[PDB]
Amino acid sequence: SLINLKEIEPQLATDPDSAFFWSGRTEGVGGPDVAEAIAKSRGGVTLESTIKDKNIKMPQSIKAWEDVSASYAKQVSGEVRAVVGQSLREGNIWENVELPRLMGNDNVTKITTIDPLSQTEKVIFVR
């Protein structure tokens, strides 16, 4: 592996009701920077903003991101928000790594999606 997962994991923990996820684009609008803007404008964080703001060094590159994404998902609690576009990439981390671990996270109480362009919301899970 390209990273030292065991020492990074504690830094991926998030405050309750603060974690955001994201995937895809709608009419070409989306991606990690748009998700971070939506998240921070609403008082929350993303995986990328956590990595940047907690100064975690990230690049085998795909495996590193999968491991950190899974750890981030495992450590959230409360209400979760996800900026999910209409156009998703086959194999994306949100559907293949993160959302299954959110479903397996007994502390997740709600998942709400937000479109990256319109910001229309949909509740997709209530536990």
Numbering used by the authors: 252 to 310, 318 to 385
Which of the paper's sentences describe this entry?
Here, we identify and characterize a novel toxin domain in Pantoea ananatis that displays remarkable structural and functional conservation with the human enzyme CD38. This bacterial toxin, fused to a type VI secretion system (T6SS) PAAR domain, harbors a C-terminal ADP-ribosyl cyclase (ARC) domain that hydrolyzes NAD+ and NADP+in vitro and in vivo, leading to growth inhibition in both bacterial and eukaryotic cells. We show that this bacterial toxin, designated ARCtox, shares the catalytic residues, enzymatic activity, and overall fold of CD38, yet functions as a cytotoxic effector capable of depleting NAD+ and NADP+ in both bacteria and eukaryotic target cells, suggesting a dual role in microbial competition and host interaction. We demonstrate that the C-terminal extension of a specialized PAAR protein from P. ananatis, PANA_2924, acts as a potent cytotoxic effector, exhibiting both antibacterial and anti-eukaryotic activity through depletion of the cellular NAD+/NADP+ pool.
Crystallization of the PANA_2924 extension was, however, achieved after dissociating the immunity protein from the complex by adding urea to the affinity chromatography washing buffer, followed by refolding and SEC purification of the isolated toxin. An X-ray diffraction dataset was collected, and the structure was solved by molecular replacement using the AlphaFold3 model, followed by refinement to a resolution of 1.6 Å. PANA_2924 crystallized in the space group P212121, with two molecules per asymmetric unit. These two molecules adopt similar conformations. However, while the first chain could be modeled from residues 252 to 385, missing a flexible loop from 311 to 317, the second chain could be modeled from residues 250 to 385, missing a different flexible loop (amino acids 345–349). The structure reveals a globular fold with two lobes, consisting of a four-stranded β-sheet covered by a helical cap composed of five α-helices. A search for structural homologues using DALI showed that the PANA_2924 C-terminal extension displays a fold similar to the human protein CD38 (Z-score: 8.6). Although the overall identity of the PANA_2924-C and CD38 domains retrieved using DALI is relatively low (26.3%), the two domains are indeed structurally similar. Indeed, substitution of any of the ARCtox putative catalytic residues, W273, E299, W323, and E356, by alanines abolished ARCtox activity in E. coli. Upon incubation with ARCtox, NAD+ and NADP+ were converted into nicotinamide and ADP-ribose.
